[PDB]
Design an enzyme around this catalytic site. Structure first.
Site, PDB file in Angstrom:
ATOM      1  N   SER A 196       0.465  -0.924   0.122  1.00 49.62           N
ATOM      2  CA  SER A 196       0.019   0.396  -0.158  1.00 49.62           C
ATOM      3  C   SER A 196       0.934   1.439  -0.534  1.00 49.62           C
ATOM      4  O   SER A 196       1.663   1.444  -0.986  1.00 49.62           O
ATOM      5  CB  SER A 196      -0.881  -0.341   1.067  1.00 49.62           C
ATOM      6  OG  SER A 196      -1.814   0.790   0.878  1.00 49.62           O
TER       7      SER A 196
ATOM      8  N   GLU B  49      -9.419  -5.346  -4.359  1.00 47.78           N
ATOM      9  CA  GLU B  49      -8.668  -4.220  -3.366  1.00 47.78           C
ATOM     10  C   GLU B  49      -9.479  -2.806  -2.960  1.00 47.78           C
ATOM     11  O   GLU B  49      -8.686  -2.553  -2.009  1.00 47.78           O
ATOM     12  CB  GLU B  49      -7.491  -3.981  -4.808  1.00 47.78           C
ATOM     13  CG  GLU B  49      -6.777  -4.918  -5.270  1.00 47.78           C
ATOM     14  CD  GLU B  49      -5.379  -4.148  -4.143  1.00 47.78           C
ATOM     15  OE1 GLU B  49      -5.522  -3.192  -3.221  1.00 47.78           O
ATOM     16  OE2 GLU B  49      -4.256  -5.355  -4.227  1.00 47.78           O
TER      17      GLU B  49
ATOM     18  N   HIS C 176      -8.458  -5.946   0.939  1.00 50.93           N
ATOM     19  CA  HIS C 176      -6.679  -5.335   0.729  1.00 50.93           C
ATOM     20  C   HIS C 176      -5.976  -5.605   2.057  1.00 50.93           C
ATOM     21  O   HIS C 176      -6.079  -4.928   3.191  1.00 50.93           O
ATOM     22  CB  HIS C 176      -6.682  -3.739  -0.211  1.00 50.93           C
ATOM     23  CG  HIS C 176      -5.486  -2.944   0.300  1.00 50.93           C
ATOM     24  ND1 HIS C 176      -4.394  -2.530  -0.395  1.00 50.93           N
ATOM     25  CD2 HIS C 176      -4.749  -2.265   1.810  1.00 50.93           C
ATOM     26  CE1 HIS C 176      -3.277  -1.773   0.265  1.00 50.93           C
ATOM     27  NE2 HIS C 176      -4.008  -2.053   1.072  1.00 50.93           N
TER      28      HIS C 176
END
Ligand SMILES: NC(=O)c1cc[n+](CCCn2ccnc2/C=N/O)cc1
Ligand SMILES: NC(=O)c1cc[n+](CCCn2ccnc2/C=N/O)cc1
Lengths: 540, 540
Positions: free
Chosen positions: A200, A331, A444
Site C-alpha cells: 500500500s 482491492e 486489501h
C-alpha cells in the site's frame, strides 16, 4: 550461541534476542536507533543520523510506534486492530529491526527491507503480521524493517521553507536505507543485494525511492504490493499541502490571537503543541467527504521528487532493474466500510442503485459530475442495473481500480517498456482465518500474512494447505531477492512465472492451486482510468 | 472494629471495604448484585431480581460497566475520558453500590440515590467523579448508586411486543430503588427519606420516575441537575423507536435474507449478535446530522409513561413533593465540539456567520427552515451580527436553552405552580483544574465533582476556596435530603435560598461568592422555546 546475540555496528554495540520458529531458531535485533529522536525543535525536520553510543543498547524488543491516529471504527475487532499500534506512541520512534538466520550467514546474504503501509498516516514495524522470523528461517535471507514518521509528523509540508520542508517520513526511510548499507554486513547481509518491498503506502514509498536518485543507489530490486507512487492518493501538490498544513495550524490554535503567519512563526507554534493534539485534528483538515484520501502524504516539491511520479515514470530509464508488482483480488472492498453509504461489515452490504451512485462520488472524489456518469455507466451491468450484489462488487471494483490496480498496471507497463524486468501477480487466496465478512473476498492487506509466513505460527489455526502455500510464496519472494527472478533457478517442473510485458501483459494468480498465467491486469477497466478519463477531465 | 464491613441483606451476606477521606473513614459496599445478569435470552427484557446467594459476596470493588459506546473524539484527553468506562464492559452489569458513614449510623439516616447521566447511551456508577466517600463522610448521609443498562441494551424498543418492550433501563433503576427500600436499613439508612438525584440523562431519569406511579412510591424528593424528562432528546415516539430498532437489526444482518421480519424473529436474531457488534452500529441508526440526539432513549409506550412527559407534567399533582433543579452557566458549550462546524476545543472556536447558521441546524435538528430563521433572528445581536465571539456564545445559548435550560425551567415552573416546593440554582463556578478550553465557561456536567466533594481528595490540585465551596454545596444537597430545604435548618447568618415559584422565578447562583438571589431562568429566551416556537410548528 549466546555470542551471536551480540553485534557491533558503527554507532555502538547491540544485544539481540533469540526467536523461535517450528523449523529452527532466528536471531533478531529489534529496536536499533538509526536516527536522533526527532523531537522539540526537530519536529518536522529531516532526520539526523543517530550519534554513537556508549555501552550496549538493548535490542530485544520493538521500540515505540510513531504518533498516529488509532482506528476506532470497529472496537475489539481483529480485522481492524491488527493494524493499530501495539507499542506506546512517541515521537521517539526512529528505530529499525533486523532479523538474521541462526547460525549467522558466513557469506554475504541478500537483504529484504520492509516498508509498512497505512496511508502515510499510520503503521508500525512491530505489528504481528510483519514478524520476520518465519521468512528468515525458511529462506535464510536477512530481513530489515524500519519505522518512519507518519501523518503530520512525517509529511506536513510548507514547501520552500526550511522549518517544514515535507517528505521527512520518506527521508526517515532513506536514512534507514543508508544505515543498511553501512551496517547490514555486520549481521551477515549483502549491502550489494538489497531488495525493497512494501505494501500500500509502503509500496508507494518503494516507488518513490525508485524515482529519487539519492535513494536509487541504496537498493537494487523493488517489490510493490497493492500500491504505487502514481496513485491518486499517494502525492499532493505544493499548494494543497500548504493549505492543509495551515488548516491544521488553525485547528490547534496557530497562530495565536492576532499575530503573523509566515512559515516560521507557524511551524514554531506547531512545535509547541503536544503530539496527540495534532493527531486529534488530522482528519478535519481535508474536505472530509472522502474514502481513500489522506491528509499528509508525500508532496511534489521538486526536491525529493523533481516532478510528479507520473512524469518521472514516463521519462525514466529502468534498465538493470527488476520489479515484482501485484494486487489482491478485491482491492477496494475493505475501504467501502469506511464511508460508502449502505456498507457495513456486519450485513451483506447489498446497496441500492442510489447508494452506488453516491458511493462513486465518495470513492472517486473531486471529479466532475460528467466524469462520475462515465464511471457509473462504465461499471454498470445493463442487463442487471439494479442487482444489489452486482452493484456492491461494482463499487468495490470502482474504488479498487481507480486507487490501486490501475495505478499499479500503469507503472508496471511503463517499467517493462522502459527496460526493467517486471513480474506481476494477483493474490486470490482468502485466508481461512479471515475475520472480515465473506462479501469482501480477498481484501486489501491480507496477502502480507502469507508473504511473512504467519501461517507457520503454531499458535494460529491456519490449514496445512495454507502453510505449504505460505512457504511457496516465501520462496517466490526470496528467489526474487536473491536472483531477481521469482522462478526456481533449477526447477522447471513447477509452473513458470513469465515476465510482465507492455504487450503480453502476463501475470500469475497466487492461490492454493499451482501457478496459472493470465493476460491483462484489468486491461479494459484500466484503459478507462488511464486513457479515457484524463481526456474527459479536460472539459472544465 | 472491622466487623462493620460485614452486612447481611435479603439475598445473602456482603463484605465491604473501608475507604479513607481526610476527615475520617467510610464503609463502602461496591458491586452489590441487585438483578439477575440480563444476558442471553434475557437481553432487552425487564430485569429480574437477583436470587439469593450462598456464602459471602465480595463487595470491595466496582463491578463491570454496562456495554456502551466509548468516546474517542479526543484520545488521551482528561475532559472526555473522565466519562469513559473505567471497568471492563459486560452485559453482567446490574450492580449497585452503597456508601455509609463510619461508625455506621445507629438511627435511620436519609438516603441519597445517584443516577448517572450519559444520554442514555453511556455512563457508569464507578466513575471517579461519582465517588461518594466525601459526601458521606462530610454529611453523615447514606449514598447509593446503581448501574442501569444504556444504549440498545437498555432502551431498544419494538413497542407492543414482549421480546423488547423498551424502557428496561428505567426498570433497572426502579429495581435498584425497590432494592433500597428492602435493604438500605441494613446499612443504617432510612427507607422513608430517599432523595433521588441525577444529572443530564440521569436527571431526566429522575423526572420519569416522578411521572411513573410504580416508581413514585420508592422515593420522596428529587434533584434534577442539567436535565429534565421533557427535553427534546430524552424521549422518543413508538413509531420512531420501531424504525430505529429495525435499522439496527438491518445493520447487523437481522433478519437473514429471506426470513420474516416480525418482532419475534427480529429480537431472536438480535440476541444472537455479540454485544460489541450492536454497540458498533448504534450511531448509524439516526439520520446522523445532530448534536444532541441519541439513538435509544425512553419510549412513550403507555406502560412506564402513560403519556408524554410534557402531558404528565401539566396534568400532574405534585403536592407533598420537594424538588431541587438547576443548570450550569454554559450548558451548550460542551456539545458544540461534537459536530458543530467551525468548533474545536484546541482553538478559540471563533465561528463565522455562515457557521453559526449551519450550527443552528445541527443544534436544533428537527425544525423547519422558517423555525430556524426564528432561532437565528432571536439569538443574533443585531448591532454585532458578525462578531465571532458573540456568535460562538449565541450558538452555545441556542443549544443550551433548547436542550437543557428551557426544558428544566418549564418543568420547575409547572411543579411549583402545581403544589411542589421547588428550589432552583445556576452553577457558575468554573473549576480551576478544568481541562476544557476557557471559551466553554462552565460546561455541562462540571458541577458534579463539587456536589460529590472531589476537591477534598488530597491527590488533587483544587484550591482552598473550592474545598470550602464543595463543603458548602454538600451541605445544601444533604440539607435538602434530610429536610427538603437546602437552607440551614437553624442558621440565618448565611444568605438564604428562597423557593422557586412560577411567578417570582427565584433561583440562586452557586459559586465562590455567597448566595445571590436572581429572577428568571433565561425567561426571555425560554418563552421563545416554550411558547412561541410550538406555534410555528403548528403551521404544518
Ligand atoms: N476521525 C475521523 O473522523 C476519521 C475519518 C475517516 N478516517 C478514515 C481512516 C480509515 N481508513 C482505513 C483505510 N483507509 C481509510 C480511509 N478512509 O477514508 C479516519 C478517521
Ligand atoms: N461514531 C461517530 O461518528 C459518532 C458520532 C456522534 N457521536 C456523538 C457524541 C456523543 N455526545 C457527547 C456529547 N454530546 C454528544 C452528542 N452528540 O450528538 C459519537 C460518535
Amino acid at each position: 550461541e549466546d555470542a551471536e546475540l551480540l553485534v557491533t555496528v558503527r554507532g555502538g554495540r547491540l544485544r539481540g534476542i533469540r526467536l523461535k520458529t517450528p523449523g529452527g531458531p532466528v536471531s533478531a535485533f529489534l529496536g536499533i536507533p538509526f536516527a536522533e529522536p526527532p523531537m522539540g525543535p526537530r519536529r518536522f525536520l529531516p532526520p539526523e543520523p543517530k550519534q554513537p553510543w556508549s555501552g550496549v543498547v538493548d535490542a530485544t524488543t520493538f521500540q515505540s510506534v510513531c504518533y498516529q491516529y488509532v482506528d476506532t471504527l470497529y472496537p475489539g475487532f481483529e480485522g481492524t486492530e491488527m493494524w493499530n499500534p501495539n507499542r506506546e506512541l512517541s515521537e521517539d520512534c526512529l528505530y529499525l529491526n533486523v532479523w538474521t538466520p541462526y547460525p549467522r550467514p558466513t557469506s554475504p546474504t541478500p537483504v529484504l527491507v520492509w516498508i509498512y503501509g497505512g496511508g502515510f498516516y499510520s503503521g508500525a514495524s512491530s505489528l504481528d503480521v510483519y514478524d520476520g522470523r518465519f521468512l528468515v528461517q525458511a529462506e535464510r535471507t536477512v530481513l530489515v524493517s524500519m519505522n518512519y514518521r507518519v501523518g503530520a509528523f512525517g509529511f506536513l509540508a510548507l514547501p520552500g521553507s526550511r522549518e517544514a520542508p515535507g517528505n521527512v517520513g520518506l527521508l526517515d526511510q532513506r536514512l534507514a536505507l543508508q544505515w543498511v548499507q553501512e551496517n547490514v554486513a555486520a549481521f551477515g547481509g549483502d549491502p550489494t543485494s538489497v531488495t525493497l518491498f512494501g505494501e500500500s503506502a509502503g509500496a508507494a514509498s518503494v516507488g518513490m525511492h525508485l524515482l529519487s536518485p539519492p535513494s536509487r543507489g541504496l537498493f537494487h530490486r523493488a517489490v510493490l504490493q497493492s500500491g504505487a507512487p502514481n496513485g491518486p492518493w499517494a502525492t499532493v501538490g505544493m499548494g494543497e499541502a500548504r493549505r492543509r498544513a495551515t488548516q491544521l495550524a488553525h485547528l490547534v490554535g496557530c497562530p495565536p490571537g492576532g499575530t503573523g503567519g509566515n512559515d516560521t512563526e507557524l511551524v514554531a507554534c506547531l512545535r509547541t503543541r503536544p503530539a496527540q493534539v495534532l493527531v486529534n485534528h488530522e482528519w478535519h483538515v481535508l474536505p472530509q467527504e472522502s474514502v481513500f484520501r489522506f491528509s499528509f502524504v508525500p508532496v511534489v516539491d521538486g526536491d525529493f521528487l523533481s516532478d510528479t511520479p507520473e512524469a518521472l515514470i514516463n521519462a525514466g530509464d529502468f534498465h538493470g532493474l527488476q520489479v515484482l508488482v501485484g494486487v489482491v483480488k478485491d482491492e477496494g472492498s475493505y475501504f467501502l466500510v469506511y464511508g460508502a453509504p449502505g456498507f457495513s461489515k456486519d450485513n451483506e452490504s447489498l446497496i441500492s442503485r442510489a447508494e452506488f451512485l453516491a458511493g462513486v462520488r465518495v470513492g472517486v472524489p473531486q471529479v466532475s459530475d460528467l466524469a462520475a456518469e462515465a464511471v457509473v455507466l462504465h461499471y454498470t451491468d445493463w442487463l442487471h442495473p439494479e442487482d444489489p450484489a452486482r452493484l456492491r462488487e461494482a463499487l468495490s471494483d470502482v474504488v479498487g481500480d481507480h486507487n490501486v490496480v490501475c495505478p499499479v498496471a500503469q507503472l508496471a507497463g511503463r517499467l517493462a517498456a522502459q527496460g526493467a524486468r517486471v513480474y506481476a501477480y494477483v493474490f486470490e487466496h482468502r485466508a481461512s482465518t479471515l475475520s472480515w465478512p465473506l462479501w469482501m473476498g480477498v481484501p486489501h492487506g491480507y496477502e502480507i500474512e502469507f508473504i511473512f509466513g504467519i501461517p507457520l505460527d503454531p499458535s494460529r489455526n491456519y490449514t496445512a494447505e495454507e502453510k505449504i502455500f505460505a512457504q511457496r510464496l516465501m520462496r517466490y519472494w526470496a528467489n526474487f531477492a536473491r536472483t531477481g527472478d521469482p522462478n526456481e533457478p533449477r526447477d522447471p517442473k513447477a509452473p513458470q512465472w513469465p515476465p510482465y510485458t507492455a504487450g503480453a501483459q502476463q501475470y500469475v494468480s497466487l492461490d492454493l492451486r499451482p501457478l496459472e498465467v493470465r493476460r491483462g491486469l484489468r486491461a479494459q477497466a484500466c484503459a478507462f482510468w488511464n486513457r479515457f478519463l484524463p481526456k474527459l477531465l479536460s472539459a472544465t
